[PDB]
Design a protein around this nucleic acid. Structure first.
Lengths: 1186, 173
RNA sequence: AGGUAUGUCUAACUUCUCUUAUUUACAAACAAAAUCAA
């Protein structure tokens, strides 16, 4: 019997974008022989990690480091009296101090010491989640949210040394907001806010700790009880000029305090407030404080929940005495930012927990302390200042922004073939389509006469050292010639009466045009004139099959018998022909040779029978043979510059594309790399780009596939344009890099520019003063009948309000005849929304208000007046909030809190057609989905999925299966009839399947007999009904099929029958914290056997390195060396529940980056294929499976 | 639902019964006892079907049909007022008691005549607590056949409690 | 020879405490010795 056992291949296509941690240190010295500068930053999101530099005033990707496979719960850089390397704490409790190093040709992250603490999980006892380092780098401190605090004393030597941990344990005191005070080397002092866990009243009390380097323990110093309203602590550096006595800034909600260590000085300064105070107004708070000091002037920046950015300076109050004062003022503010840094340069890096990280340079620096108007003082602690925010943005100037989606709420999958993902932007509220396809610009296109075929571009020999370049087009009957110059595109002898098989430049200032019947040898004469010095014709006449060429070299193949070899004479311009017969023993199909060099060995010949031969250019010999499928449609030979590999790119008829490694000396055919793209005979062309210079081959089919090879990797890709008939690299004085001249399949010339390429790190491009939209997006919708038309729905933060913005095709739509591209709905807020078509010709929209009211709308497309017109129809009161609804046949299928109502279409309001009462277990329905209108899968907050079946004439959904365990399901879909996808609030990605015992029953029986009537259940099921009525109430159970843990929270699953024409249908998910990843079902077995073995290798690979490094120490690198963190793979990915059949490809991908020594060291554990074939199978997934 | 089956040869086994009755209807469960002392089948089984429709069907078609080991297979489908009366006359027949108590209430069973101490007493079963109250009210401490009889509730301590009227009312309902 | 009439003959029924001892096996990759600038 065939084992179902779905084998899913997880990939992270785009890596988690919500940046939770940052560090200011200078890690690597790159591109400079000797340089030391403190300006650089490394930022971490849980697993994912990135390293940015500025140094230009504009932020720069340095390298995206390998996936750590853990949850980084804090990261802080340490600077010791040297290269500054960051201390990193995560799950496993391990304190892992890592240095970013340059190894081989890339930057890899090396670990120095990892210290075991607590256990492996995210815990309250776990001394993580609160971490800071002595600003002089003498000691690192970790703490726990509740139980205990540990502080290591860090020392540097020939090898780094971490001192034994210093423990303090307070059982009932829940710790929050660790903030360490800088010191002069006196003694390290850290400050916390301890809230008592077990108490009758809520008591939040600050506590000071001075670690004593002399006595080597942490000492409780001052315990100050403050109001329960407390928020956070910041460290005031010295106050050495005013009057060891550290001073802290305690942010409360509606006011700020600062407190002395000795309690002598406690200063209350009330935080100012906005003028509008829109709708709901909290007492607010300050989320993030930071400190800066220069030229005796130290100011701190503290930002409120509204994003208001404030400063504090200290004044002596010379009149009274020398004593500290506290002075608030107002700045440019910003959006809410989790953490703030400042370079030694005037650049202030704002890391926003909301969406985007952006960097500043401050000039105005803010208002002077002299003004009493807008500045508040500690003179009178009771006072209030109202201020209107300033969008003019005087103080701070945005230099660089980083496009990221931290809160991606929903998305729809648009343009299934190029995997394009349509999702909102949270703050800016712009439409973001992030795409797998290559980003392709289009500029100054021009309409060509109909029925065009191929294209070429050759430098104009007539004008030497000039921008003029000749562009050649082809029609079957006619050939068109065109002249290129900057901004000047003009039209022009040669042969216009016959199709052009080939044309190329020879040597210097010469051209040859090969056409079906005869050749032409053309040379430039004067400016607009050219002259053929010789012409070639078959002896008895013949139709030339194909032609290829090199720089100085040429080949043409006629109908059948012989092939013709040409060269150009050196020191002059001439053509010669050899006397010889290369009979080729068959009819030559197409010819290929390297045109990159003046002399190209190893011609590549194709045969109509479907075989490919090599020709040694002693002289000619056939060293290899390929029998491949259908006849070759087109083929190109290209040797890359970097590695010098000569690759033969062989396109085939019916749309199969192929690629071959070609040995230079032997000419053997090895390393077959195939693909299937579209249905059409493919076309190929060669282009050269950068992103270091680079070369790719464009492939023309139903789609357009650029095949490019990055370093030791290559990825075929679809391009953003729908189709391209013929493509060749182009250059213009108008700035052109990656620039290309091509033609659409419509027979229209166009110029374009490719920009971003889907590398392993990116795999996407994101198509989108300070800009913040008041409307925060809600959901995203798409019409069933229109294949892709995407409707967006947002909300207002304030008085309840909504907007609806519909887009189809390129950009949005107008609303009616109005200028506005969106619609505003007053007093309507959307808890959940879905669009429905009750009749095939009518389209309605569905809103569920927080007022518990169901609102119906009508969508209109104006069509060449084209605009969206929304129309309010009915009003219906609802009992529940309606968290989930969807399209059932002809009807709205909605879920109340308890029960599932199926509404029909009534007039003046919509009607309840049927109601289904849930089993007692289900409290609420988060999300639900249908299978072909027959079946449903209904999710819960607390409990798990339960599948229903619609019974006609019973007018009810009957639950036929329960779920095994309790799982909190955010989003849920169907792969099939019998299986279900689901995610968790906590990050589990699982897939369940109904048991075959149930599938036989439902396949062999009608649903009407389930609720009442005769259905014969095996003896065990009934005994489970009377024995365990609570679990088996639904009389079946989901056997766990696939389970996985992705640390994000999955927002949207989508099951795509094909990803960029790939055969294996994938399921792609976007997470909330932002991510998109896929689960690819693996066909056959040895696919998942080899993948499983590679994952098993990379799993303990760090341990294998540790045991080798151990044995060599027995005959004469820590344990977490290769993983950089203590977490095992199976442990991290297992976590909540063990992964079942899912093998994680995100691990096996890390095998690609390791050096050849390490890789060959790992693969020796297998009797199976060599490292090269390993990398083959690894890279096979992105190419072939999507 | 459940049917009794009997006149079974101990050589008839469980799989043989199952294969037998699946021919008639679907069989939910089979309880086919096994003697622990003799280590043998005691020759009667119980077959629980999926409903009394298939149960009664198998009772109709199966009864006196299948012949197993020459022996025929058999199939068969699987709280009132009580008054103690003392000092009755020796001339009082049970049928005379029936006639006496019929006027007051319908009798669910026949009276029970027994002798205490010499002392003729009887138990009379009424279908109704209220009709029993009638026979009590009229017949208590009365002279029949020139003998004084006492009519009260029989012990269970004696019938006629508060919960007794409540539940006997329901059993009437 | 045919037809009619008459007569006679013949055929056709379920859902093995405590106590104090003795006897005997068993478990725990349980531990095995010496030397001592340990």
């Amino acid at each position: 019997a065939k084992d179902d056992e779905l084998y899913l291949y997880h990939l992270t296509l785009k890596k988690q974008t919500n940046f939770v941690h940052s560090c200011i240190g200078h890690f690597v010295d790159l591109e400079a022989g000797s340089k030391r500068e403190q300006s650089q930053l490394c930022v971490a999101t849980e697993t994912h990690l990135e390293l940015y530099d500025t140094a230009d005033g504009e932020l720069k990707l340095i390298a995206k480091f390998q996936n750590l496979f853990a949850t980084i719960t804090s990261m802080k850089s340490l600077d010791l009296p040297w290269p500054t390397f960051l201390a990193l704490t995560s799950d496993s409790g391990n304190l892992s101090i890592v240095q970013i190093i340059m190894h081989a040709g890339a930057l890899r992250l090396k670990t120095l010491v990892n210290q075991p603490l607590t256990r492996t999980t995210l815990r309250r006892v776990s001394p993580i989640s609160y971490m800071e380092i002595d600003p002089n780098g003498r000691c690192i401190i970790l703490s726990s949210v509740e139980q205990n605090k540990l502080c290591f004393l860090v020392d540097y030597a020939q090898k780094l040394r971490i001192s034994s941990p210093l423990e303090i344990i307070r059982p009932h005191m829940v710790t929050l907001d660790m903030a360490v005070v800088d010191v002069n080397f006196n003694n390290p002092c850290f400050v916390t806010l301890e809230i008592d866990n077990a108490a009758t009243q809520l008591s939040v009390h600050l506590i000071f700790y001075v670690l004593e380097l002399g006595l080597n323990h942490i000492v409780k110093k001052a315990d100050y009880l403050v109001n329960p309203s407390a928020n956070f602590v910041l460290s005031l550096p010295d106050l050495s000029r005013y009057n060891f006595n550290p001073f802290v800034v305690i942010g409360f909600e509606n006011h700020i305090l600062v407190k002395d260590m000795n309690g002598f000085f406690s200063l209350k300064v009330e935080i100012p407030k906005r003028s509008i105070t829109n709708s709901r107004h909290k007492n607010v708070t300050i989320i993030s404080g930071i400190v800066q000091k220069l030229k005796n002037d130290f100011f701190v920046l503290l930002q409120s929940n509204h994003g208001d950015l404030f400063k504090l300076t200290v004044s002596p109050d010379t009149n009274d005495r020398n004593r500290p004062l506290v002075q608030l003022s107002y700045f440019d503010t910003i959006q809410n930012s989790h953490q703030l840094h400042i370079f030694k340069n005037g650049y202030l890096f704002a890391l926003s927990e909301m969406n985007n990280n952006f960097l500043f340079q401050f000039e105005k620096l803010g208002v002077e302390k002299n003004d009493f108007s807008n500045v508040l003082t500690s003179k009178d602690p009771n006072k209030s200042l109202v201020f209107e925010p300033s969008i003019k943005l005087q103080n701070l100037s945005i230099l660089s922004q980083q496009l990221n989606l931290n809160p991606s709420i929903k998305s729809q999958i648009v343009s299934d073939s190029p995997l394009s993902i349509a999702t909102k932007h949270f703050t800016n509220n712009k439409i973001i389509t992030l795409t797998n396809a290559v980003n392709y610009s289009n500029l100054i296109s021009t309409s060509l006469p109909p029925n065009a075929t191929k294209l070429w571009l050759i430098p104009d020999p007539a004008t030497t050292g000039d921008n003029n370049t000749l562009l050649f087009i082809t029609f079957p009957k006619k050939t068109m010639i065109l002249q290129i110059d900057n901004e000047s595109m003009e039209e022009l002898f040669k042969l216009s009466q016959d199709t052009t098989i080939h044309t190329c430049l020879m040597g210097s200032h010469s051209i040859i045009q090969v056409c079906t019947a005869e050749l032409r040898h053309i040379v430039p004469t004067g400016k607009s004139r050219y002259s053929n010095k010789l012409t070639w014709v078959p002896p008895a006449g013949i139709r030339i099959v194909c032609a290829t060429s090199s720089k100085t070299q040429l080949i043409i193949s006629l109908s059948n018998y012989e092939l013709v070899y040409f060269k150009i004479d050196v020191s002059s311009d001439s053509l010669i022909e050899l006397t010889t017969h290369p009979e080729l023993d068959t009819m030559p199909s197409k010819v290929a040779i390297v045109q990159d060099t003046q002399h190209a060995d190893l011609l590549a010949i194709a045969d109509n029978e479907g075989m490919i031969k090599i020709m040694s250019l002693d002289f000619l010999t056939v060293i290899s043979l390929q029998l491949v499928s259908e006849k070759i449609s087109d083929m190109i030979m290209v040797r890359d510059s970097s590695i010098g590999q000569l690759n033969l790119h062989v396109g085939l008829e019916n749309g199969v594309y192929m690629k071959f490694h070609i040995g230079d000396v032997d000419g053997s055919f090895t390393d077959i790399k195939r693909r299937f793209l579209g249905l059409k005979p493919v076309s190929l062309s060669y282009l050269r780009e950068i992103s270091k210079w680079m070369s790719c081959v464009v492939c023309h089919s139903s789609s357009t596939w650029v095949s490019y090879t990055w370093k030791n990797v290559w990825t075929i890709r679809q391009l953003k344009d729908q189709n391209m008939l013929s493509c060749s690299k182009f250059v213009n004085a108008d700035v052109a890099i990656n620039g290309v001249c091509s033609i659409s399949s419509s027979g229209r010339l166009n110029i374009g520019r490719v920009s971003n390429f889907p590398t392993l790190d990116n795999w996407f491009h994101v198509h989108e003063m300070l800009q913040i939209s008041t409307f925060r997006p809600r959901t995203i919708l798409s019409f069933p009948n229109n294949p892709k038309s995407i409707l967006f729905i947002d909300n207002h933060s304030g008085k309840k309000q909504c907007r609806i913005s519909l887009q189809i095709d390129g950009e949005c739509l107008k609303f009616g005849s109005s200028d506005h591209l969106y619609k505003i709905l007053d007093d309507i807020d959307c808890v959940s929304a879905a669009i429905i078509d009750f009749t095939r010709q009518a389209d309605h929209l569905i809103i569920c208000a927080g007022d518990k009211r169901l609102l119906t709308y009508k969508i209109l497309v104006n069509k060449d007046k084209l605009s969206f017109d929304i129309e309010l129809l009915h009003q219906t009161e609802i009992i529940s909030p309606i968290h989930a609804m969807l399209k059932f046949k002809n009807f709205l299928l909605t879920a109340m809190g308890s029960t599932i109502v199926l509404y029909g279409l009534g007039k003046k309001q919509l009607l309840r057609r049927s109601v289904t009462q849930t089993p007692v277990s289900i409290t609420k329905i988060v999300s639900m989905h249908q299978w072909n209108y027959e079946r449903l899968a209904v999710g819960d907050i607390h409990e798990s999925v339960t599948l229903f079946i619609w019974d006609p004439a019973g007018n009810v959904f009957i639950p036929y299966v329960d779920d095994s365990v309790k799982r909190h399901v955010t989003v849920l879909k169907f792969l099939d009839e019998a299986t279900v996808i689901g995610a968790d609030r906590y990050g589990n990605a699982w897939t369940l399947r109904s048991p075959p015992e149930c599938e036989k029953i439902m396949s062999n029986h009608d649903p009407s007999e389930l609720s009442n009537g005769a259905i014969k259940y095996p003896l065990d099921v009934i005994t489970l009904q009377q024995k365990l009525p609570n679990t088996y109430d639904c009389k079946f159970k989901f056997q766990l099929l696939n389970h996985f843990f992705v640390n994000d929270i999955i927002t949207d699953f989508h099951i795509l029958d094909s990803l960029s024409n790939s055969d294996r249908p994938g399921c792609i998910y976007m997470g909330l914290q932002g991510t998109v990843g896929c689960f690819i079902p693996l066909l056959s077995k040895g696919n998942v056997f080899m993948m499983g073995n590679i994952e098993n290798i990379m799993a303990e690979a760090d341990d294998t390195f540790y045991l080798d490094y151990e044995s060599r120490k027995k005959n004469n690198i820590c344990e977490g060396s290769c993983s950089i963190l203590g977490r095992d793979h199976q442990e991290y990915r297992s976590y909540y529940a063990p992964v079942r059949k899912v093998i994680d490809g995100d691990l096996c991908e890390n095998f690609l980056r390791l050096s050849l020594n390490e890789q060959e060291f790992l693969a020796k554990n297998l009797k199976s294929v060599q490292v090269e074939d390993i990398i083959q199978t690894i890279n096979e997934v992105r190419t072939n499976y999507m | 639902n459940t049917v009794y089956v009997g006149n079974i040869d101990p050589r008839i086994t469980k799989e043989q019964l199952y294969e037998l009755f699946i021919q008639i209807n679907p069989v939910l469960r089979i309880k086919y006892p096994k003697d622990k002392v003799l280590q043998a089948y005691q020759g009667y089984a119980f077959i629980e079907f999926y409903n009394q429709g298939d149960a009664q069907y198998a009772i109709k078609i199966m009864n006196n049909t299948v012949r197993l080991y020459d022996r025929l297979i058999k199939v068969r489908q699987v709280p009132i007022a009580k008054l103690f009366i003392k000092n009755l006359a020796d001339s009082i027949d049970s049928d005379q008691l029936v006639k006496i108590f019929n006027k007051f209430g319908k009798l669910i069973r026949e009276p029970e005549i027994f002798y205490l101490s010499k002392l003729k007493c009887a138990y009379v079963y009424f279908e109704d607590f209220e009709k029993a109250d009638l026979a009590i009210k009229s017949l208590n401490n009365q002279l029949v056949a020139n003998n004084r009889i006492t009519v009260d509730y029989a012990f269970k301590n004696g019938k006629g409690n508060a919960k007794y009227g409540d539940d006997v009312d329901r059993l009437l309902n």
